[PDB]
């Protein structure tokens, strides 16, 4: 069975487009965003999210992750695609080779 | 207060450490296909490179541990990397898990060396061309070395990972304590924290590789 | 002529292979049997010499 | 026709019609894993979002059990 | 040091032995590298004509 | 930038005095459906959607609270 | 019992029975050490 060609259309690497489409009818385009900002402000206002040293280690590792992704993402995607293309080319070559061998026989 | 991130986590009273230790293999999906997605492609390339690195130096009997040593390095590296995310509990900071990883493998290698190989196993404690009046001393040394190899394995992982985390946390506190004071100094401390984060990624991978390489050498000295 | 009809059957078989991106590994070991792991000579993973990898 | 998937079925009896067995919960978790995997990971030309979403859920879980320690670091009292 | 509290030591050892010796190894066993598709166009156990 | 406002002018604005009767009628419809228990017609899809919108307006209330105590984190005193 | 030992123990049998025997002895040793540590505590 062949795989699809694209994934699930995530936004910001965290939330899929299905959520934005699901809130589009009742709360429009800014609905999900005001829900997100409201939840963030309620979390860090009622001190559900306690600001500590882990906030800054979190910001550091998230910055390193976003930078590393934006930088070495094209390279890793192209590397995987080229690995698959080389394997496919080698396989097609080795199939035609045996066809030619039996035709020669 | 300071070692709060190394205490066995519990959610609603249950040992979440079990889930945290079982999670790493979930990030390695496998497939029967011949040409598959980018994640499995990159992971299989990495596993092949790792196997060729760790296992080419062994003979036919040491190469039966390819599964064991590749599993060890993959498990430790993924645990150490997942320990870098915010608020996470890293099980490789625990001396219990690291002792349970180190003692079985080292003991298995030395018992494998004493079951077969027994002549060469007992000869290994003496270097080849050791002069005569020094033969006793170099047997007291080498012996205790062979007896600290397991502990010095586990500790070397624990003491490292723990320490790294501690340092980062402390620097984090610094930034927080400096957020209400001069902001250029806060940005300088934050840049130190970013460099430390990159160093901690490197040390995660390096510690996985070194634990596995020392186990591999103990195996190579007994096959 | 017997050998030739066998060869023609085999060439039809090779010509009617499923494309390689719908192909499992058992299908490859059926198509090109030289791509099969010698799980008798090498019983343990990776079932081949490490240099072969 | 009470096999209606949740998000389509309004009833509480449906809640008790499900297979709340160990094998049932195992099948439920495995079906969820394969739904996520087929939607986000098991595609060609896949994205890294299929991993960063897992890591975000992991960080949320990690914060959940780290709250009993952080609630002593709150900077207000109410 | 919470690492010295020996009461939670089994909780840290028992899942590891499942993850290191069972699950990761079952996932490496399903990571197989087939041998190259090398097609020999030289394979003909022939013989001279009947003379 | 400005697209935020392009959507906010239609969505994130207060209700004009002309459409408060519409809101009163909708509130009456909701309380009626709660009275007669007719909400057993609402699929859990739409139930979740309504719950999310109610959570959003509660978050509006809490944002109004943080703008009414002049301090974001907790109570400044 | 079925489809578990078909997907867990049939693949891992060559290793559990032949390759890791010394690992099993060493794991007994490790359990003994851990018992002596937890008991003297
Ligand atoms: C295993 C545990 C790991 C734990 C992590 C510990 C710390 C490690 C940090 C190191 C980071 C370095 C990573 C670099 C290598 C990653 C390779 C890569 O990105 O390839 C993606 C590559 C291309 O995907 P793509 O999304 O189309 O490319 C994105 C482009 O780079 C272009 O990107 P874009 O600009 O379109 O993307 C927008 C932007 C998101 O936009 C933002 O800036 C939003 C930020 C706000 C969020 C808060 O980027 C993000 O997605 C950031 C989201 C981060 C949220 C993380 C939450 C936690 O996809 C793949 O190849 C998929 C498989 C990759 C193989 C992974 C290797 C093996 C993994 C082993 C176990 C896992
Ligand atoms: C939703 C979370 C997924 C939890 C169940 C994972 C699963 O059963 O997928 C099978 C999953 C797929 O394995 P695969 O056939 O090698 O792709 O099996 C595992 O990943 C091994 C079990 C890991 C346990 C993780 C505990 C958290």
Swiss-Prot record, chain B:
The cellular location(s) given in this protein's UniProt record come to: Mitochondrion inner membrane
Gene Ontology BP terms: proton motive force-driven ATP synthesis; proton motive force-driven mitochondrial ATP synthesis; proton transmembrane transport; response to hyperoxia
Enumerate the InterPro entries for this protein: ATP_synth_F0_asu (IPR000568), ATP_synth_F0_asu_AS (IPR023011), ATP_synth_F0_asu_bact/mt (IPR045083), F0_ATP_A_sf (IPR035908)
Recorded topology in the membrane: Multi-pass membrane protein
Gene Ontology CC terms: mitochondrial inner membrane; mitochondrion; proton-transporting ATP synthase complex
Q: What CDD domains does UniProt report for this protein, alphabetically?
A: ATP-synt_Fo_a_6 (cd00310)
Q: Name one GO molecular function term.
A: proton channel activity
Q: Which UniProt keywords apply?
A: ATP synthesis, Cardiomyopathy, CF(0), Disease variant, Hydrogen ion transport, Ion transport, Leber hereditary optic neuropathy, Leigh syndrome, Membrane, Mitochondrion, Mitochondrion inner membrane, Neuropathy, Primary mitochondrial disease, Retinitis pigmentosa, Transmembrane, Transmembrane helix, Transport
Question: Can you state which reaction this protein catalyses?
Answer: H(+)(in) = H(+)(out)
Q: Which Gene3D superfamilies match?
A: ATP synthase, F0 complex, subunit A
UniProt effect for mutating residue 153 to P = In LS, MC5DM1 and APAO
Query: Pfam families, per this entry?
Result: ATP-synt_A
TM segment ranges: 3-23, 65-85, 94-114, 135-155, 161-181, 186-206
Q: Which family does it belong to?
A: Belongs to the ATPase A chain family.
What is the protein named?
A: ATP synthase F(0) complex subunit a
Source species of the chain: Homo sapiens (Human)
Please spell out the taxonomic lineage of the organism that makes this protein. Eukaryota, Metazoa, Chordata, Craniata, Vertebrata
From Swiss-Prot, chain C:
* GO cellular component terms listed in the entry, alphabetical order: mitochondrial inner membrane; mitochondrion; proton-transporting ATP synthase complex
Q: Where in the cell is it found?
A: Mitochondrion; Mitochondrion inner membrane
Which Gene Ontology molecular-function terms are recorded? proton transmembrane transporter activity
- Could you tell me the Gene Ontology terms of the biological process aspect for this record? proton motive force-driven ATP synthesis; proton motive force-driven mitochondrial ATP synthesis
Entry's transmembrane regions: none
Write the record's keywords in alphabetical order, separated by commas. Acetylation, CF(0), Hydrogen ion transport, Ion transport, Membrane, Mitochondrion, Mitochondrion inner membrane, Transport
Indicate where the modification N6-succinyllysine is found in the sequence: 36, 41
Q: Which residues carry this modification: N6-acetyllysine?
A: 9, 36, 41
| Function, as annotated | Subunit d, of the mitochondrial membrane ATP synthase complex (F(1)F(0) ATP synthase or Complex V) that produces ATP from ADP in the presence of a proton gradient across the membrane which is generated by electron transport complexes of the respiratory chain. ATP synthase complex consist of a soluble F(1) head domain - the catalytic core - and a membrane F(1) domain - the membrane proton channel. These two domains are linked by a central stalk rotating inside the F(1) region and a stationary peripheral stalk.
As for family, the record states:
Belongs to the ATPase d subunit family.
Name of the featured protein: ATP synthase peripheral stalk subunit d, mitochondrial
Query: What organism does this protein naturally occur in?
Result: Homo sapiens (Human)
Curated annotation (Swiss-Prot), chain E:
Q: What does this protein do?
A: Subunit 8, of the mitochondrial membrane ATP synthase complex (F(1)F(0) ATP synthase or Complex V) that produces ATP from ADP in the presence of a proton gradient across the membrane which is generated by electron transport complexes of the respiratory chain. ATP synthase complex consist of a soluble F(1) head domain - the catalytic core - and a membrane F(1) domain - the membrane proton channel. These two domains are linked by a central stalk rotating inside the F(1) region and a stationary peripheral stalk.
Alphabetical GO CC annotations of the entry are: mitochondrial inner membrane; mitochondrion; proton-transporting ATP synthase complex
> What residue stretch is flagged as signal peptide?
none
Q: How does it sit in the membrane?
A: Single-pass membrane protein
Q: Which UniProt keywords apply?
A: Acetylation, ATP synthesis, Cardiomyopathy, CF(0), Disease variant, Hydrogen ion transport, Ion transport, Membrane, Mitochondrion, Primary mitochondrial disease, Transmembrane, Transmembrane helix, Transport
Q: Which gene encodes it?
A: MT-ATP8
Q: In Gene Ontology terms, what is one molecular function of this protein?
A: proton transmembrane transporter activity
Keyword Acetylation listed? The answer is: yes
Q: What is the lineage of its organism?
A: Eukaryota, Metazoa, Chordata, Craniata, Vertebrata
Q: What coarse category fits the chief subcellular location reported for this protein?
A: mitochondrion
Biological process, per Gene Ontology: proton motive force-driven ATP synthesis; proton motive force-driven mitochondrial ATP synthesis
Residue ranges spanning the membrane: these are: 8-21
Entry similarity comment: Belongs to the ATPase protein 8 family.
Q: Does the keyword Ion transport apply?
A: yes
Protein's name according to its UniProt entry? ATP synthase F(0) complex subunit 8
Q: Which domain of life is it from?
A: Eukaryota
Its annotated compartments are: Mitochondrion membrane
UniProtKB/Swiss-Prot annotation, chain F:
The Gene Ontology CC terms held by the record are: mitochondrial inner membrane; mitochondrion; proton-transporting ATP synthase complex
Protein's GO biological process: proton motive force-driven ATP synthesis; proton motive force-driven mitochondrial ATP synthesis
Compartments where found = Mitochondrion; Mitochondrion inner membrane
Q: Name one GO molecular function term.
A: proton transmembrane transporter activity
- UniProt KW Mitochondrion keyword: yes
Top-level taxon in the UniProt lineage: Eukaryota
Q: Where is this chain primarily localised?
A: mitochondrion
Q: Which residues form a coiled coil?
A: none
Whether Oxidoreductase counts among this entry's keywords is no
N6-acetyllysine occurs at: 9, 28
The protein's UniProt keywords, in alphabetical order, are: Acetylation, ATP synthesis, CF(0), Hydrogen ion transport, Ion transport, Membrane, Mitochondrion, Mitochondrion inner membrane, Transport
Subunit text: Component of the ATP synthase complex composed at least of ATP5F1A/subunit alpha, ATP5F1B/subunit beta, ATP5MC1/subunit c (homooctomer), MT-ATP6/subunit a, MT-ATP8/subunit 8, ATP5ME/subunit e, ATP5MF/subunit f, ATP5MG/subunit g, ATP5MK/subunit k, ATP5MJ/subunit j, ATP5F1C/subunit gamma, ATP5F1D/subunit delta, ATP5F1E/subunit epsilon, ATP5PF/subunit F6, ATP5PB/subunit b, ATP5PD/subunit d, ATP5PO/subunit OSCP.
Please report which protein family the annotation says this sequence is part of.
Belongs to the ATPase g subunit family.
Official protein name in the record:
ATP synthase F(0) complex subunit g, mitochondrial
Q: Which organism is it from?
A: Homo sapiens
Which start and end residues of the full protein are shown?
A: 27 to 103 of 103
